[PDB]
Every structure is written in C-alpha cells, then in structure tokens.
C-alpha cells in the first residue's frame, strides 16, 4: 500500500513569507538559466571571460517555449512542498520541457545523489549543460532517466490519465498535473478531464489540473487560448472543476508582484483542496468541484520579445528555440548573452560554481523533494502480492475425466483467482475495464469489491456493484484504462485490465511508450526499482467475434508487441491461454513478474480444457510442449506430420483434426505454444527454446501444420532462422469473416478442423489421400450450407469431444 | 402484499369538465345537508311540512366547524378518484368531523351495502340522521364502524404517522391526510411531518398532507393560522414539502369559481405527484419535495355568518355547533331552517328521498370508493405469514445439560426468528424501533434487509445497514414507531417494534386508542376482517436498567394494559419470556395472532435457559406450569411453600432461593407464569386457568411466594377471587433502584434470592429458622457492601448455577 509521507492536506494559516518568494524568484531565474544552459552551451556554464560562439552547441536540441512557464510553477510548487510538508508528484504534460525537470532535480540535490559525476560546482554545471539532448548524454524529455518523472510527455495526451492513476489508493498524494494547451486538443487528454467522476476524495489522493495556457502549440494558436474566457471557464465547470485563472507576463508587472499574486492564488486553491480532504473524512459520497488552474502566460516567457523583427515571446516561434542559432553571427550570439545575463547569474552562483544557499533555503528536504519522493520511483514502494495457492483454482476435471473435457469459460477462472488476490491485497491491486469487465468474465471481483463511481446514483435496479470506493474502475476509453493502470503501477501498486482484442489497437501507441519506458529502465536506470507488470487480458478475440462482425475482428496487437521484443529487454510477454489451467499458470507468472507488458490472449467462450495445472506450468516454463497423450507418433522419426497450435481456438481445431487423422491411422505429433516468444530466434532472445529444443518439439525434417491465433506473418517472421522453418504451413486470421457462426469464422480463414485435416493429408501425400481430401472440402461447403439453412453449425462441428475424454 | 388497485399516478391531460364540478358542488351541498341533519334532526329529514321544533334532537352532539371544510375536500377527492382511477385512502385528522365520513359512505353507497337497514330514501335518511351519536347508534367520530376509516382521530396527533404507515410497501396507494391546525400543535403530529425522510417514492406510496387551516381549535386561534404566511411556507419547505395554499370563503366569490380554482390547483399538485412517481421508477435515491396543501377556509364555512350577534363563520364558536340549540326559541329554529334551506335540498333529493343521479354521476364506483377500498378494511388483504420452523431456533442445550444452563441473551433468538420471517414475507413484515433495534438485540434482521433511510448518506464508515428501501425503520419517536406500525397492520400487513420498557409509557395513550379500536371491532364490526397484531418487544427492562438508573426503571406498562382486559375481547397479550425458548413459543403465538396488542416482556441480558421448546409450548398453552423437575415436594400436600416467578429475573432469583431451600431439606413447589392473563378471574376471562387448574398449580392452602417482574399491585388485583389468594406473598418492583449492580437492583426491591429464601422461611417458621433468616438478612447487607467496595457483585450471587446443570 502507498506510504503516508509528511503532513498531508495542511493549511499554512499565515501569509507566504516574503523570504520564500525571493527564494521562488531565484529558483525561477536559476532554473531558466540552467534550462537555456542545457539547450545552448557545451562549455563555460557561468560565462567566465572569454565567452564566445565556441561555447555554444553546434545543433540546438530542446524546447524553450513551455520551459519558463514550467520553471515558474515548479518553483512555486517546491515552496509549497516545504511550507506544507505535502507528499507531491508532478505530471509534466509538456514533457518536451525536459530542461525544467532536469533543472528541478539538480537544484533539489537528487541529480547529484543519483549521478555523482554531476557535482554542484562549475565542473558539474559544464557536464550538466553539455549532456542535455547530447550523444552519450540524457534525453530532451522528462524521461525515466530523470528523478521526479513517472511521465515522459513525449507522446502527448496521457497527462490526466496518469495523474489520476497515481492518486488512486494514495490518499496522502498531491499531483499537480500540468497539461499543455495543445496537448488539450488530443482525444486522450479531452476525456482525461472526466476522470474526476472515478476518484474518491477520502480513499484516493488529489489531482490539481494546471492548463499551461501559453496560447500556442508548434505552429498554430491553441483552440482553448482563442475561444472566449467565458467559454473556457464554462467548459471546466461543466467537467466538475472550479476554474481559477492566473494571467501574468503580458505587461511590465514586476516578477515579485507576480510571485505574490501567484503564491496567494495557490494557497487559496490549496485551502479549498484541504477543505475537500477534511470534508471527505466525514462525507465522501458527494462529489466536490475540484479546483483547476488556467495558467495563462506568454509562450517562451522572459526570452526576447522580438528576434530578427519577428515576435518570439508570446508566439509559436518560441516553441523549439526563439533564436535558431547563436553560432551563425555576432548579433545572434549577443542576443543569447543578453538573454542569459537577464537572469543575473552573478547573484545565483558562488565562486566555485555552486548555487548560493539563499537560492535554495526555501526548498523541501529528504523524501518530500520532487526527485526523491518514492511515488516517483514506485518500485521502492512495490511489495510482492500475497498470492493464493494456484491449486485452489485448477480445473480438476481434466485429471478425472481426461484431456479436452468440458465447456468452461476460461476467463471465469482468472476472475476467481483475481477476486481472491484483491481479497488478500486490499488497496494494492486494481482491475480496469473499458465497460467490458463483465463481458470479459472477470466479474467475480464484485464478490470482494465494487466499481468505483463518484458520479450520481439513481436506483438499486441499475447501480449494481458500484460504490464511491472500489478496486474496479470502468470508463468507455481504452486510453483512460491503460493510463490509469500505468500510473498505479509506476506508483508501486499492481493490477490488470481487459479489452476486446480488436479495440486493444486504440492504445497501441500507449503500449509503445510504456514498452519504451520499460526498455530504457532495464537497460540504463538501475536506481529505478522494478514495478509490477502491465497485465492486459486480451479476450472476446477474433475467432469468436462472430456475433459482432468484421469491425471487431483484428488480433493484430500481437504484431505490435512483437515490435518491442529486442536486446533481451524481456519487457514484453505474449501468452495464449490454451485453457483455464494454462491461464492460471500465465496469471501466476504475470502477477509475480515486474517491468513487463503481459498480453494474455484467452477465450471467454465455452471451450475444452486440455491441460492439468501441473502440465500447464511445465509447458509454460518452456513456452511450447509436445502433447504425448495426443500424439500417435511415439518419436519424431515415426511422425508423418506435426500439428502445432497457438490459441484456445486454433488448439480446438488442431485437436479435432488430430482425431480425424487418427481415424486414418496417420502418425502425427501434437504441439502447443503458450509463449509466442519461446519460438523467437535463440540469437535474439536468450529465454527462447534453444535450436536443439525447438528441433526436439517441432522435429528437424517433417512438415509442420501450424494453426495460429493471429496473422500468419507473426510466426513466419519469428522462426525465419529456426530449424525446419520452410516446412511450417502457418494458417491464421486472413481478414475474412462477418456476422456468421463460429464454424464459418474458422472455415472462411482456412483454419477450420476439416481444412486443417485436408492440409495435413496434402502435406503427407495429396495423391494417396486425394479422395479423403476432396471429401473434407465437400464437407466444408456442406457444413457452411447447414449454417445458412439452419442458422447454427453442423453437429459434426458442434458435438465433437476429444476421443481422449471418458463420457 | 398490498394490492395494485385502479390506474395509479395517472395525469388527467385535460381541464376538469364543468359537469364534474357541478357534481362536486351538489356533493358538497348534500354532504353539508346530511352533516347538519346528523347533528340536529331526530326525524323529518327532507323538512316536509310540517317541519317543527319536534323534528330536532334534544341533546346536540357532534362537530360542525371542521365538517363543511372536510366535505368540500372529500367531494373534490371523489371527483379526482373517479377521473384518475387512483387507489385512495383518506386520513381524517379532525376525526371529530365524523358526519363528513358517514355522509361520504352513504353517498358512495358503502353505508347501505354494510347496513342494508339504512336505505337510499326518506325512510333511510331518517334512520341515518337519528342513529348518529345517539343511544344504540354510531359514534360522533370517524370510528371503525364507518367504511373508509383506519383512523378515528379521537385522540388527536397520529394523523401523519398513520398516513405514512399506510403507504409503506404500498406503491399504488395515495393518502390525502387531512390534519387539523389544532392537531398540528401536538407533539406526535409536529414530529409526523418529518416521516418524508423515512419513506421512498418508488417502493412506498404517496401521502399528500392537507393542513385544515380553519383558523381555530375549540376556544383559541391556531398558532399556524396566526403566524405570517411567509413563516408558514418556510416551515413546510424546511420539513421537505412543496407548500400550496388555497384561500377561499372569506369573501363573496361564488361557490362554482371556488370549485374551478380548487380543481385546477388539485390537478396541478397531482401532476407534481405523478412526476414524482414517474421520476422514482428511475431515481428513487434523491428525496423530492413532496407537495402539501395549506387549505385556509373559515371554520364552520357556510354556517350563518353570525348567530345572536356573535361571529360563528370563521370563529372557534362553530367548533361544536354554532346554533347552541334549535328548540329553546322559534328564532333559533328559523336559523336552522334557513341554514338547511341554503343548500337547496329540493335540487338534491327526488320526492322519493333518494339522492338524485346528477349528484353522484361524478363519483367513483367499485373498489375505488373511499368506503369500498380494501386498504380501509386491511383484514381482506392480510395473508398469513409463511413462518419458519420454531424447532430450528430452539436452545437445544437445556436437553443436553439440563435446566438453568447458559448465559444467552434471549432477544438474539427472537431476532434470528424475525430475520427469517422478513426473508420469507418480503414487503409484508416490518420492524420499527426508536433507535433501539440493535440495543434490544434484533439486528440479525440486517442480514436480509436494511434500515429504511431517505435523508442524506455521507460515509460507508457510519451509514451501515441503511438503504432508501428496507423493512426496518428507526426514528427517536415512540409515537412514530407505534403510529407507523398501527397503520401498517390496518392496511393488512404484519410487524413488530421494540422499546425500553420505561419509555413504552410515552405511547400509553396510543395503546389505549388502538386497544379501543380493537375492542369495538371484535364486539360489533364483523365486516371489518381481522388485522395482524401490534407486537411490542418490551426489553431493557427495570431489573437490568442498573446501567441507566432510576429514570429508566418503570415496568408500569403491564398495569396500563390490564385496563383493557374485559368482555373476553382478548385484544391484549401480556407475556413474560422466561428464557429464549419461552420467547420463541410466545413469538409464534403473537405472529399467528390477530386483532391483538401483544406485549412481550423479555430480557436482553445474559441469563439461564430454564425450558426446552416443548416445556415452553406446554407452559404457554395454559400460561403457568408447575416445574416438576424443580420442586422438592412431589405433591401439593408434601409442599411447605410454593415459589412462583413471572419474568426472567424474578425466575432467576426464585430458582436460586430454591437451591438454598433445597440444601436445608425444605419441601417446595416451583411455579412459572408466562402468560399474566392466565392468573385472571375465570369469571372475567374464559381463557384463564380454572379455579381448579389454579389451586392445582398454586395449592389450595399453602403460602405462595410470588416474584413478579413488575409492580406487585398488578398480581394483587388480578387474583382477588382466586383459591389461596390471601396466602400469596407478592414481591415486585417498588420504585427502589439507582445506577448500581444487578444484585443491588433485586436487593433494594426485596426480590433477591437471599430475601426470597428468607421470606419462604418466614412464611414456614419465623421461629424454627430465625437463625438462617437472621444469617440470610446479614449476607444481603454484606453482599451490597462487597459491591460498593469492589464495584462488582459478591461471587455467591455471580457464580451460582442451578443444582440441575452440568455434564
Ligand atoms: C500525439 C502527438 N502528436 C503530435 C506530437 C508532436 N508535438 C509535440 S509538442 C507539440 C505541440 C504541443 O504544444 P502544447 O501542448 O501546447 O505545448 P507547449 O506550448 O507547452 O510547448 C506537438 C504537435 C506529439 N508529441 N504527440
Ligand atoms: C390529544 C388531544 N387533546 C385534546 C383533545 C380534545 N379536542 C378535541 S377537538 C380539539 C380541538 C381540535 O382543533 P383542530 O384539530 O384544529 O380541529 P378543527 O378545527 O378541524 O375542528 C380538542 C382540544 C383531543 N381530541 N386530543
Ligand atoms: Ca502550449
Ligand atoms: Ca382547526
């Protein structure tokens, strides 16, 4: 569970001291100086004579525009943290403001504690400026290499989904979430505002949304800066917020007047947030209007108003660098010098290059610091879940009645197990769902918890399994559900979410950014401790989207995840729950895992159980296993064909084909694949089957019929350098299907049992079996015609039960 | 359950027809005519010449002031019921407006269907005017003898508690509840207004409170008529009502315009109530402001404006009769004649004496009639409870280890039993409690239902066992709990309420009124089918109010109920649950019971269990038993003294005395009274023990030591004519006690085991035993001193178990 840090939700009960504001104004000046430093200077950080074009970087990389606004807010938030003792994480939406985030960590001391080479003197300062967005150095964004970051802000949109995920089950946590006014135009951001109806002010922390209304994005004004102020205020009132607006920097008002006005506005906002938290201890079923701050300042604030007779301060022109070169002419270098000199660094550093005591006296200490708070390194908070005994959830009937028994909905088993994990790990585990938790059969969790809902209630006849507090959250937004969970994990908790397989593609780009976050962490951030995995139940999959049709038929997230499977990062898991027992073995491995995205493809549709839990754990350990109890061949040499499957439905059809092939006395080895990456080149993936183990399972020389859940391309790409790879006949999804029957779905994708049988016969001897083949092909048309005439599948398809069952 | 009658919550969707409103004014006129007739005329209803002073009544008995106003309202309600098809019960707050309710029943034709002797002609009018409030006739109030009444309104103040009880689990029922402005000054009424936070507009019906603001009570203006209209409006709004005011009859405005205005306002109020009922099918968690009608009309409306130079219309002087006598002078007869003529009775009756057809054409028919509605005759709705199996609740351990076993809280047993009653009779059974349901140990109910609460919710940390709908209701008003349950039974449902014994006295007057309702019903109202019994758990009793003290120590309710045990009405049960097993037997008896007020005196303290369920049934069947197993005497001749207890605690002390009498070789009978009315004079009660059965149990010649739960005066008055009654030595509560120990409570009322032992010896041989008697007296003064010194009771009192226990 999240730790209670400092003295939360405390009013100052006194005006902000003048000496604190002089601190903030000094922070701002030194942060802006460090920020311009990182962008423009390779050397001479303090402009010791001689200071020349030689000291300026050859390529200017990084963003000024957003930065001075961020520096202003973080200065004021640091003052606020020290005065109040408030557990604070910032979300930097404008992640391209990376200079503001590195400057923060430097100034609060966490940069030097984390990277000892980066000292507090002229030497460290030189290295600090140079290394920014520099080969062999650190990124342009508020990346995971930055202490204080749980949000890089590279792909804009997720500032609010992450803020709200961070405060869930974290009642002492305050999150200023700084939202770009351009970011506000993305879809993900636009729905994120609505998150204030899915958090409770007693059991969760508090998000303060801050609209960085600097008027501009890259090359355009922003919608929200160019609509009437009355429309802007209404918009945020209508999303359940109390909008405050701060305007500064558009006139000659002196900086200390600005700090006084801001510090007083912030404390008035803070006082309302404390009354919300005090009220929540008595009444947490009435949703308050949560403050938010419209922060309207000029983009590029404090840079030169004009450069080359073009407007730069208060323009889109300041977004990257207001001055495109400092090397090209004397005059341009002069501009950089007067700009850097405008902050008066001579008042900010002592002789040996360190920031003066009186610049940092107001700052917070120890774990309250932005860069040192454990919420911003949630692995140090993360505990192992108390897991219940896996054996308690096993489908025992496989052992009694034998392989292929029953018509169980596999995902109900993961539902029972996940229920009891929530029972034993209250406040540490959450399920998210895009209005699909029940549809994906995880509703067993409602036995120990509720859907968290902090909008209106109306009736017990409709409002089932809802409470203002609960470990399940649903909104119809893959972006919200991915976003919430990501931040929950990054702040040291655990969970899972489910989606219909086709609509996983809505958050492909979020999976990408989270993969990339994890790739960077395992590679080069050993201080950033492991977080619980992002566990995604991919269900209501293509083969059984026969009730919804072509729109809902796309297993392609497999292809997308395969694009994050390099360099032995081991940050991606792709699992095919063959059955309920294999789903348990995968759930066990995923729930115990850290630093991964786990895709678990599992049918929710009635299907057979093939494996005992013991057999499934043994198979999962390797990723693929021969099924000796289903093989007719006793060794590889005897085997005329290999029948391999990956997925509940490809396994059903391959297992049905095996039975028809066994009636013709064919010698065939059956193979199951639960771990896609177990098939990956041994050269790329040191956890994959060895080429000797691969050859053992799939044989060295025989024809392999491979029925795959997703697109054949997936497998054909993975096994390019595997032994016997040219003898893989890989059938998968083929962009065929509609509103039809389960049999038609596999038929039309040439993965139905009758086709898989015919293909095996073709691969053994098309001549010897030309007749049986022809008969199979005629049966396929017969079986379709049956569906069209009757409106359900032929009973040969429907009523089949593995020969190996005793009924 | 309560039946769905007519087309409930229907909008009219058109103006009221002129024809309908002509109807209502005729109704008003004829009902004013029938009402003055009942008060003043013994003969010659239609004033056929000669009409003289000899057609008047000698004694003028009945109330006018309220009646014209009631007649106006009832008329307009009948128009409403007929146009809409609305399930409707009225509550006549000013029950002294009896003439209005009888007038109603005659006109709707339920009077002639119930009393075929009272026909629709001059002959029937003559019987009808005579019979009213007249020897060997019918009462002055809206008594139970009147179809449409479930509320006499003799004892003012219960109008709203009855209205709100009536609507509970009755979603089709509409209850216009007419409240006197004088009734409003009473406590029970003043608190009754708040019942709108304890009812739900989906699962319960609607009460429309109508304040009959006629300006006056008997001799005084009413407070609510002489405060500003602004305060009046704010008052009702503050109590969660939408107040509507109708002012009429204080100017020369024509009757037909008054009708037009009123019907408009009525249909506007009805449209609101329909919108409330429609909304509630979707949102029944948000409490609406319920409409209420301030009806401001002159008291005595349509009486002479003056009589003998005294203001009568719009004055307290019309309260009874504005015409003090119609026989004292001729002038006074003229005033009566003129008054009766101003309704133009020749337009209302045909020369036959039938009320014409144009007068009733507008009226409701069938079961929608105020008279015919089954909710006003609840017995016709009353089903038997599906009762669970009494054996399933038995304390089995008395068989195992013998009489006197355990320290169980008896009320917990009653509570598990009643829990299962609710579970099996959903929407048919209710528990009421004045914030004492848990304190009296009846909270097992919370397993299957909740406390009904329709004010605000705030937190799951305080709002336990509470839903907007449930079968348990709690307010800190004994008047509300008693009132709600009364109306719940009258409308043909079942329930129980519990109270601290002392505080049952708050509602003595309501026990009186309901007993009298039941007395009259069983005597001469066979058409009024039998209603479920008013079952009252009387716990937290005098002996174990050692924690609260003197104020909480009053078992008087027994004394009060005995004053309603006559004529073999059998409308009062007074039971003492000896233990949990006696309580189950007493409970089943009460829950199957009808047309009774059952008072069940049972302790909630840890006590011994004396009887199996079979010994309990047996003992309860007759209402007293000899405990063979307890007696040392094997017959009545051998016995030296009879020990008798009524009540758990007297039973304990008597049984402990019995063990000290046993260890001195004394021979004694042990008797237990469970049903107090079994000791009643067999002259007075044909269910009481016969003088033979009595003398058998209590011997005919032996001295009887009687430990009585309550005041000794009770038993001393009940047995005045019983065998061996002068030999009864009755110890009971004697207004001694404080905040003290359990022993000191019995000690200071001379009913402790040591005094009971001493008295048994004093009644055998004051002299032979003067050494044991003196020693017992010295231990009483020595165990009290132990308790003062150590603050718990002497181990001899505390650790005692009956002889006949243990493995
Ligand atoms: C999803 C996405 N689309 C496009 C971009 C490219 N992009 C990066 S910064 C930016 C403008 C952002 O402006 P705003 O949020 O207003 O930031 P600020 O003014 O604070 O720099 C754009 C289009 C992106 N990073 N992410
Ligand atoms: C508790 C109680 N106290 C006193 C009375 C005696 N009583 C009968 S009528 C009456 C006045 C009632 O006036 P209101 O309710 O305003 O009746 P209305 O004006 O409709 O005649 C009184 C004091 C009573 N019935 N009940
Ligand atoms: Ca911007
Ligand atoms: Ca009155």
mmCIF file of C-alpha atoms in Angstrom, chain A residues 202 281-286 457-461 467, chain B residues 202 281-286 457-461 467:
data_model
loop_
_atom_site.group_PDB
_atom_site.id
_atom_site.type_symbol
_atom_site.label_atom_id
_atom_site.label_comp_id
_atom_site.label_asym_id
_atom_site.label_seq_id
_atom_site.Cartn_x
_atom_site.Cartn_y
_atom_site.Cartn_z
ATOM 1 C CA UNK A 202 -11.242 10.134 1.011
ATOM 2 C CA UNK A 281 -13.246 12.251 6.225
ATOM 3 C CA UNK A 282 -16.964 12.813 7.124
ATOM 4 C CA UNK A 283 -18.763 12.887 3.677
ATOM 5 C CA UNK A 284 -17.121 11.161 0.691
ATOM 6 C CA UNK A 285 -20.287 10.244 -1.307
ATOM 7 C CA UNK A 286 -20.891 13.853 -2.637
ATOM 8 C CA UNK A 457 -26.529 7.116 -8.206
ATOM 9 C CA UNK A 458 -30.279 6.767 -9.060
ATOM 10 C CA UNK A 459 -31.533 3.178 -8.330
ATOM 11 C CA UNK A 460 -30.648 -0.274 -6.842
ATOM 12 C CA UNK A 461 -32.326 -1.779 -10.051
ATOM 13 C CA UNK A 467 -19.513 2.248 -4.597
ATOM 14 C CA UNK B 202 -40.803 4.021 -5.669
ATOM 15 C CA UNK B 281 -39.168 4.476 -11.384
ATOM 16 C CA UNK B 282 -35.686 5.815 -12.484
ATOM 17 C CA UNK B 283 -34.290 7.849 -9.496
ATOM 18 C CA UNK B 284 -35.585 6.804 -6.039
ATOM 19 C CA UNK B 285 -32.285 7.811 -4.226
ATOM 20 C CA UNK B 286 -32.970 11.630 -4.458
ATOM 21 C CA UNK B 457 -25.942 9.445 3.189
ATOM 22 C CA UNK B 458 -22.338 10.604 3.871
ATOM 23 C CA UNK B 459 -19.945 7.663 4.512
ATOM 24 C CA UNK B 460 -19.754 3.826 4.472
ATOM 25 C CA UNK B 461 -17.911 4.206 7.881
ATOM 26 C CA UNK B 467 -30.926 1.706 2.289
#
